[PDB]
């Protein structure tokens, strides 16, 4: 009852915040045009913060609503939540569902993506407020965030000596300048993550393997001639 539920919720929130903070550090000092850093900003919604505090410390003021056996616990949570912030409306949905929503810790968190652009401070990442290359780089950043999170999630269901493969793509890679490509190579190398990139020959990354393609007509049929190079550097 009461306090203990609040404590488990608080610890879960704290652990998620800390893990995010650890992921966050790997993305410091990534140069993409005028973008110089990326973050996942995590915050707690007020309407739930006050509820969590009330459930922690003012339980004697609401115990009537919790020990009334005519209604279940999740229903009690929903009714308490409506008692606070009374302006909230309920869409003719069962209080049971609203209760289970309050039981799910994720609903307490607010999430944003921010970038440290140029002379300015931390700004929310909007596509329309960035150049093309900056947008591509930011996308790659968020994708590696997702992959790391998923690997941390599943490892409790995997063998102790198994490490999954990680691989991502990039089409029309010519859109990135040399500095951005150096940044991207550094990221993937530090993350042990493979890349496959396509470019119409405009870029020649010295590290890795390269494949030259040429399409021809042979015996009145389309045929692709392929050559490969690797090991340079």
């Amino acid at each position: 009852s009461s306090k203990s539920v609040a404590n488990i919720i608080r610890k879960t929130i704290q652990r998620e915040q800390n893990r995010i903070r650890m992921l966050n550090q790997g993305l410091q000092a990534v140069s993409f045009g005028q973008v110089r850093g990326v973050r996942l900003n995590v915050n707690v919604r007020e309407s739930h913060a006050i509820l969590l505090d009330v459930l922690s410390e003012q339980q004697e003021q609401h115990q009537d609503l919790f020990n009334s056996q005519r209604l279940t616990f999740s229903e009690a949570m929903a009714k308490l939540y409506q008692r606070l912030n009374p302006q909230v409306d309920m869409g003719q949905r069962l209080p049971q569902t609203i209760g289970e929503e309050l039981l799910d810790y994720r609903n307490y968190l607010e999430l944003d993506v921010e970038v440290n652009r140029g002379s300015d401070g931390w700004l929310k990442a909007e596509s329309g407020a960035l150049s093309t290359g900056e947008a591509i780089g930011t996308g790659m950043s968020i994708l590696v965030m997702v992959v790391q999170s998923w690997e941390e999630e599943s490892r409790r269901l995997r063998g102790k000596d198994i490490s999954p493969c990680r691989l991502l793509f990039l089409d029309e890679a010519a859109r990135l300048d040399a500095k951005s490509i150096a940044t991207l190579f550094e990221l993937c190398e530090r993350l042990q993550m493979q890349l496959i990139i396509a470019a119409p020959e405009n870029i020649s990354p010295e590290k890795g393997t390269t494949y030259k393609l040429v399409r021809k007509v042979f015996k009145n049929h389309e045929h692709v001639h392929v050559v490969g190079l690797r090991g340079f550097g």
Binding site: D161, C165, E172, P205
Partner: protein, 246 residues
């Protein structure tokens, strides 16, 4: 320690590729050639082998990168050729077990442009045998013959220690891939498949993905059961009583 790696990608009887194998790099592999050479075609092969679901697979052009569904054509049919086609991956786990995973592709005849797909997996293959050799017969003609799944099953079963598994549903195929550490998450349900495909295709086209941005918490946060099941069990007595009364 010693993360696994993708080792190679093989195409058989695709548009412009009768039989081709790419040896993937440990860090970076770069495809290069003039316009229309076939680069995006190779990436199409990779992803279709990875996620063989025709409801999700949609290879729209890079221009118009973000538009609606639009046409009924998914853009895959034209990349195949008449007859039987294959796409296969070769992987090395942290255990150093060599596993080959792939699909068989065929153009379904009709007015419309539709495709038929069947996944499969092979384990225990010797390091001395390449996929192209498994899937083709070196008949007297100038060009070899691609052999269907029946011939392939007969050919593989003859080998000692080699196991050939042929799947009836995508769920089983993804389950096996996860158990062997080829993907980072086991795709429980169609929704999981959709999110995984969102990740891949967003990486493919590039840019800040709209869908990823909308549902950020759904992607970055794991769901925790501990907070819930206590209260489902405590709630059980009331639930049964209410249902009985109704």
């Amino acid at each position: 320690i010693e993360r696994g790696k993708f080792r190679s990608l093989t195409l058989v009887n695709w548009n412009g590729f009768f039989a081709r194998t790419f040896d993937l790099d440990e860090l970076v592999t770069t495809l290069s050639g003039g316009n229309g050479a076939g680069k995006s075609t190779t990436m199409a092969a990779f992803v279709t082998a990875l996620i063989p679901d025709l409801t999700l697979l949609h290879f729209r052009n890079t221009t118009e990168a973000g538009a609606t569904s639009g046409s009924r054509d998914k853009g895959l049919h034209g990349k195949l050729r008449a007859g039987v086609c294959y796409s296969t991956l070769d992987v090395i786990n942290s255990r150093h077990q060599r596993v080959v995973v792939g699909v068989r592709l065929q153009q379904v005849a009709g007015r419309d442009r539709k495709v038929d797909i069947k996944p499969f997996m092979i384990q225990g293959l010797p390091t001395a045998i390449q996929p192209t050799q498994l899937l083709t017969e070196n008949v007297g003609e100038r060009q070899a013959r691609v052999l269907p799944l029946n011939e392939l099953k007969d050919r593989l079963d003859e080998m000692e220690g080699v196991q050939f598994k042929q799947f009836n549903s995508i769920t089983d195929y993804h389950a096996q891939m996860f158990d062997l550490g080829v993907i980072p998450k086991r795709l429980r349900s169609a929704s999981d498949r959709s999110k995984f495909y969102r990740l891949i295709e967003a990486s493919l086209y590039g840019g800040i993905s709209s869908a990823i941005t909308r549902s950020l918490r759904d992607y970055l946060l794991p769901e925790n059961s501990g907070v819930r099941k206590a209260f489902q069990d405590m709630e059980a007595a009331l639930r049964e009583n209410r249902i009985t009364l109704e």
